[PDB]
Amino acid sequence: KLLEHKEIDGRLKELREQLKELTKQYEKSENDLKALQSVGQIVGEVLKQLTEEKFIVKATNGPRYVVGCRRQLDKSKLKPGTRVALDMTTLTIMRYLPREVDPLVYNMSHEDPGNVSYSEIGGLSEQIRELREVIELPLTNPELFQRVGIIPPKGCLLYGPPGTGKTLLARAVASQLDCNFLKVVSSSIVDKYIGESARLIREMFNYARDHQPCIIFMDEIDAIGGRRFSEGTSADREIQRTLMELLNQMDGFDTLHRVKMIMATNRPDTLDPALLRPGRLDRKIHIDLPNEQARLDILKIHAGPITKHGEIDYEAIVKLSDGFNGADLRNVCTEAGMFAIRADHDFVVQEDFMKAVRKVADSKKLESKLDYKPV
């Protein structure tokens, strides 16, 4: 008859858990109700300091202003060009703020996905080693390049026929150093406006200047590059100014440091000679179609995780393979799997490879002119 302890503890534990969770809800709404009344502030940048009390700032939204600090704003922090906060009404300076990020950078900074490293690509062991020697060594050990006393090369240009894996080599670097790959696709830059693209270029170059080991990567340049015109369409004017933004601030007077620019194109014949000189892009690095041993290497790289039997004359497939791509023999293995699912074999027979090779032969009877050497 002593079960009243269990009943009292039941009601008290029910009420205690209810009070804990309900006062936790009331406390969350209490903090979110306390935080209601605050008022936002104005983002502006410091042009210059006028006097000890006077400060010349220009916000991004329009005109210029002259105000002063509050009490404890520590005026030596305000270097000319810092981004600060302003009141909406009183308009004086509130708090020094860190610099902007412009999340167009972030959508091409964080959005590196995973990948397999440079053992996945192959047959082009010149360029792999050579890009390593020209990039990784003057950023890991600069004294090898200072004992000689010769300035390191800055810009590297990948070029060649389409489909040689010009993208995936930089992607392998993006799975090797993993440091600050700002892979700009260089087509989603221009949107509609007047000087927005120039400001994005300034933003990228400031951000690369600060985070000292940055890798600049601009794929498919020829859209934003061009060469020059006799002044035809009006949007091409701002195109050429957007290009001359890069032409100045890649070189300027303030030289870049550790700002390594990796460049790739579909046809390098249409670039501007303003961009084609060394200094900006130092060494032209050429990739071409795989040879017999190279086709063997890529084929046996793709033929690794494919369910088949010990019958594969790789020499036959590479023998019928003639002047192909990174993706051609990938398409060979893919269509080999396709022909495997054709007639439901559940392994890949060796004749499916010959069928896929003749499918590639059907494909590349519609393509030509694969030799664009610049200059």
Place this chain on the structure above:
Amino acid sequence: ALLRSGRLDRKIEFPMPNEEARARIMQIHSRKMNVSPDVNYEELARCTDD
């Protein structure tokens, strides 16, 4: 660079009806019409070239 192998993968052309698919297509679109069926469609497919 629009194709190369596998930007688009399966390169598929479209043939024209050789002979028999002509009568097939005539049968398909004439399925809705009411026909007094004194018609060899194979005559018509055998005369209408290309």
